[PDB]
Amino acid sequence: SNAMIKQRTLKNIIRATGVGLHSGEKVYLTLKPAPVDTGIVFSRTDLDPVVEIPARAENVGETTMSTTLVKGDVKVDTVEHLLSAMAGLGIDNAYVELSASEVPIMDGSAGPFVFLIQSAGLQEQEAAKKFIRIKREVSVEEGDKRAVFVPFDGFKVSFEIDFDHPVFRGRTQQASVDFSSTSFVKEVSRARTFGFMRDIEYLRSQNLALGGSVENAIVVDENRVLNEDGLRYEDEFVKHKILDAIGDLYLLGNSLIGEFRGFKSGHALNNQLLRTLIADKDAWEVVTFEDARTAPISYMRP
Numbered sequence: 001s002n003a004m005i006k007q008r009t010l011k012n013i014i015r016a017t018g019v020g021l022h023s024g025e026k027v028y029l030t031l032k033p034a035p036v037d038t039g040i041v042f043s044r045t046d047l048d049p050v051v052e053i054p055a056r057a058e059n060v061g062e063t064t065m066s067t068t069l070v071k072g073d074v075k076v077d078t079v080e081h082l083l084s085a086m087a088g089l090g091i092d093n094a095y096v097e098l099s100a101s102e103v104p105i106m107d108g109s110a111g112p113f114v115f116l117i118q119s120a121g122l123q124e125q126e127a128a129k130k131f132i133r134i135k136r137e138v139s140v141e142e143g144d145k146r147a148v149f150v151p152f153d154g155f156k157v158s159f160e161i162d163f164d165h166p167v168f169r170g171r172t173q174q175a176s177v178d179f180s181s182t183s184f185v186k187e188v189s190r191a192r193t194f195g196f197m198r199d200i201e202y203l204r205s206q207n208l209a210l211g212g213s214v215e216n217a218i219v220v221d222e223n224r225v226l227n228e229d230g231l232r233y234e235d236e237f238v239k240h241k242i243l244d245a246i247g248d249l250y251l252l253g254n255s256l257i258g259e260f261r262g263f264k265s266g267h268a269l270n271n272q273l274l275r276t277l278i279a280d281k282d283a284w285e286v287v288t289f290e291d292a293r294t295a296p297i298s299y300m301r302p
């Protein structure tokens, strides 16, 4: 019906230029509109023939420093920040073209991506938006790390970090964001990625974080933030972990109706939670809404 929560795509094709956080290679990003029930599909246009990797949990390869999409030997690195923007603005179908193996880091947040998508405009499609509603509690744990899916009428993200560093200890360790009352754009999207300088030195030698800089990452010592202009939020470190979680959870293919709880969790435990959820079919269901007013999740005007 006309009053249903409709599927969404881009209104126009938008282009952006940047560098890969871990590869350091120059990359041309092209966001394009896609037909109904396509989902988010990544395309390597630098290869002949063009290789397409759908942004799904089954196509997740490595989860060391970032979330990587793999198809054979073709890779698409650091997809979590762009997928966070797609999820936050409710983009159902989109073609993501890349001229290199990694998504541009931009400023280390989802901020420029949310602006690039909203500048291009949103288009409502003649199809019902599919939602994955959490019925039962699903949790994955490994040592002192845990990732939980709790039933909730709407969408809520909770995260708890525990870094033994004065700069991290001196800041907020836990944050709960309810997207029915809080804006993804205003409070989450701007949270930049963070890294330890002494840890980044070992990574740069081991062919990782090659495109890392103070302009696209929060560089930290023991007591303070090395960035001249400081932080964007007092709780920016835990807000970025929430941003990363929203992006990782969007690999389900559909928007979530439930609560996510992250306890020192990362990209590996986030993918392991999705795989355990998909495997436990009694714990979830596919739901559509014929009336947008009755739904527990609302979206920004197209």
Ligand SMILES: NC[C@H](NC(=O)c1ccc(C#CC#Cc2ccccc2)cc1)C(=O)NO
Pocket (backbone or CB within 6 Å): 065, 066, 067, 080, 081, 193, 194, 195, 196, 200, 203, 209, 212, 213, 214, 217, 218, 219, 240, 244
């Ligand atoms: N743990 C969360 C994870 N963080 C990173 O992947 C990450 C890795 C490395 C760096 C870095 C850096 C840097 C630098 C730099 C090096 C030399 C001179 C100036 C800056 C930041 C975040 C993340 O946000 N993944 O999406």
Ligand SMILES: [Zn+2]
Pocket (backbone or CB within 6 Å): 080, 081, 193, 240, 244
């Ligand atoms: Zn991140």
